[PDB]
Amino acid sequence: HHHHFNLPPGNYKKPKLLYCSNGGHFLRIDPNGTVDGTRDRSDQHIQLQLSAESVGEVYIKSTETGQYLAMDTDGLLYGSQTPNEECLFLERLEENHYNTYISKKHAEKNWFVGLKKNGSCKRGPRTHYGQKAILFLPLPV
């Protein structure tokens, strides 16, 4: 392992909104595959269903479009129509409270799912432990 194994509580029974306290945006996967954040709780592309592939390893899927969140070879988040290695994330507890998501494929480089204060997604190499951008709270839909 390249990372700790503190896991968050909560389960995968129901869909969630992934809220980033950094700028207060919900993670959004547009039908065209682009990913960003929005503060509009009424948006229909922020409802996500997480599922466990292995303990602590998850897929994050848009319930509206079926797309899987994925991080590409250059660190950019995108919505994938089919599950692939770029769609697996290591879901962990952080700061004894938040959930973080590390790209399994790029786990050795510490590439996280993260949103900037302006709502745009962070590129993998620009993320790291200690940032506010990588901290999420799963809220009920």
Swiss-Prot record:
Biological process annotations from GO: activation of protein kinase B activity; anatomical structure morphogenesis; angiogenesis; branch elongation involved in ureteric bud branching; cellular response to heat; epithelial cell proliferation; fibroblast growth factor receptor signaling pathway; lung development
Q: Which domain of life is it from?
A: Eukaryota
Task: Place the motif Nuclear localization signal on the sequence.
Answer: 13-16
What tissues express this gene product? Predominantly expressed in kidney and brain. Detected at much lower levels in heart and skeletal muscle.
Gene Ontology molecular function: fibroblast growth factor receptor binding; growth factor activity; heparin binding; integrin binding; S100 protein binding
Q: Which residues bind heparin?
A: N22
Q: What is the effect of changing S120E?
A: Decrease in LRRC59-binding
Mutating Y98A: effect? No effect on integrin- and heparin-binding, loss of FGFR1-binding, defective in inducing FGF1 signaling, cell proliferation and cell migration
Task: Give positions of region: Heparin-binding.
Answer: 116-132
The positions making up the signal sequence are: none
Q: Which GO terms describe its cellular component?
A: cell cortex; cytoplasm; cytosol; extracellular matrix; extracellular region; extracellular space; nucleoplasm; nucleus
Keywords of the record = Acetylation, Angiogenesis, Cytoplasm, Developmental protein, Differentiation, Growth factor, Heparin-binding, Mitogen, Nucleus, Phosphoprotein, Secreted
User: Which locations, inside or outside the cell, does it occupy?
Assistant: Secreted; Cytoplasm; Cytoplasm, Cell cortex; Cytoplasm, Cytosol
Please describe the post-translational modifications of this protein: In the nucleus, phosphorylated by PKC/PRKCD.
Q: Per the record's keyword annotation, is Secreted included, yes or no?
A: yes
Q: Subunit details for this protein? A: Monomer. Homodimer. Interacts with FGFR1, FGFR2, FGFR3 and FGFR4. Affinity between fibroblast growth factors (FGFs) and their receptors is increased by heparan sulfate glycosaminoglycans that function as coreceptors. Found in a complex with FGFBP1, FGF1 and FGF2. Interacts with FGFBP1. Part of a Cu(2+)-dependent multiprotein aggregate containing FGF1, S100A13 and SYT1. Interacts with SYT1. Interacts with S100A13. Interacts with LRRC59. Interacts with CSNKA, CSNKB and FIBP. While binding with LRRC59, CSNKA and FIBP seem mutually exclusive, CSNKB and FIBP may cooperatively interact with FGF1.
Physiological role: Plays an important role in the regulation of cell survival, cell division, angiogenesis, cell differentiation and cell migration. Functions as a potent mitogen in vitro. Acts as a ligand for FGFR1 and integrins. Binds to FGFR1 in the presence of heparin leading to FGFR1 dimerization and activation via sequential autophosphorylation on tyrosine residues which act as docking sites for interacting proteins, leading to the activation of several signaling cascades. Binds to integrin ITGAV:ITGB3.
Family designation: Belongs to the heparin-binding growth factors family.
> What protein name applies here?
Fibroblast growth factor 1
Please report the organism this UniProt entry assigns to the protein.
Answer: Homo sapiens (Human)
